[PDB]
Copies of this chain bind each other. A is one copy, B any other.
Amino acid sequence: KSVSVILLAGMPKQYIPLLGQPIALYSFFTFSRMPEVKEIVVVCDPFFRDIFEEYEESIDVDLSFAIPGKERQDSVYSGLQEIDVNSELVCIHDSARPLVNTEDVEKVLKDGSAVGAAVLGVPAKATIKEVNSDSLVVKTLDRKTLWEMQTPQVIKPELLKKGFELVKSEGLEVTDAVSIVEYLKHPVYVSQGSYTNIKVTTPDDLLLAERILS
């Protein structure tokens, strides 16, 4: 019972129903059923707290809340202040990804435990190229080597906390939680996920999500 989940939860996209259940609750329930998960820190505006609070007695995890910040990394830091003092792993998840499989969460948790930092990813389907400032192709980037990142991102809290100290002291803005780990030169493992773990932003994603649940 050693994993703290930080659920980033901001009508906003993540509270739109999918088969009559707000998107954010899908991942919330997936984590809550896992015996490894001790607690879920939901980062949401106080308005939406009751959506999760309604199920506190049913779920087998402690439910905490944190206030969101101006940027995504501020929300992560706020949630990080609420986790258990003896938590072994922090599992950061975007609530706009409702379809994450339990088996994939297990994989990335295991890899995060072993490596110290890990993230779910899939091979990029599109032909991606590096382009310079004159709009010219630098090189054709290798087919096997490029991966789209998803969430969860799993990291040992002390690694993340030292990483935030480095960010605040030297003055930096980050594009994800695991890149902070890269600044510290600690390895980040890419756990191979599933193409079904989509981010629901548009109505077309909303539709695809429904097709996948079928």
Contact = CB atoms under 8 A, between A and B. Distances in A.
Interface of A: 115, 121, 124, 126-132, 135-141, 143, 145-149, 175-176, 178-179, 182, 187-192, 204, 207-208, 211
Contact of A128 (B131, B149, B208): B149
A175 B127 CA distance: 8
A166 to B, nearest CB: 15
Copies in the complex: 2
Contact of A124 (B128, B140, B176, B190): B128
Given A204-B207, A204-B211, A178 B137 contact: yes
A196 to B, nearest CB: 12
Nearest to A111: B135
Nearest to A203: B211
A130 B145 contact: yes
B204 A140 contact: no
A137 B204 contact: no
A116 B128 CA distance: 20
A127 B189 contact: no
Given A126-B148, A128-B149, 17 more contacts: A124-B126, A127-B148, A127-B176, A128-B128, A129-B146, A129-B147, A129-B149, A130-B147, A132-B145, A135-B192, A136-B189, A137-B189, A140-B179, A143-B175, A204-B204, A204-B207, A204-B211
A178 B137 CA distance: 10
Contact of A139 (B143, B182, B190): B182
